[PDB]
């Protein structure tokens, strides 16, 4: 009864649907990642976290503005 109801073809289709659904869910998660990283950007700069990581790496002992100004120069050129 079960196999007649839940055949192999139905299984394959259902599993493919599962896979595609969760791929779509990954896309959703990536979309939310991008947005949340864009929103909370003033409260979480990059330079600060970089400096903290470098300092704490030097401590734990392991190795790992002018740019925009020059781009402005190019824009003026």
């Amino acid at each position: 009864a079960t196999l007649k109801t839940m055949n192999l073809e139905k299984i394959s289709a259902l599993m493919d649907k599962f896979e595609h659904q969760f791929e779509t869910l990954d896309v959703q998660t990536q979309q939310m990642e991008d947005t949340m990283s864009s929103t909370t950007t003033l409260t979480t700069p990059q330079n600060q976290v970089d400096m903290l990581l470098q300092e704490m790496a030097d401590e734990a002992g392991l190795d790992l503005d002018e740019l925009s100004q020059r781009l402005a120069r190019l824009r003026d050129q």
């Binding site: 990283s37 990059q46 740019l67 925009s68």
Partner: peptide, 13 residues
């Protein structure tokens, strides 16, 4: 403006 600047700095990477 500040936000766009930060985003650009983060996207250049």
């Amino acid at each position: 403006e500040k936000k766009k600047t930060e985003l650009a700095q983060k996207a250049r990477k």
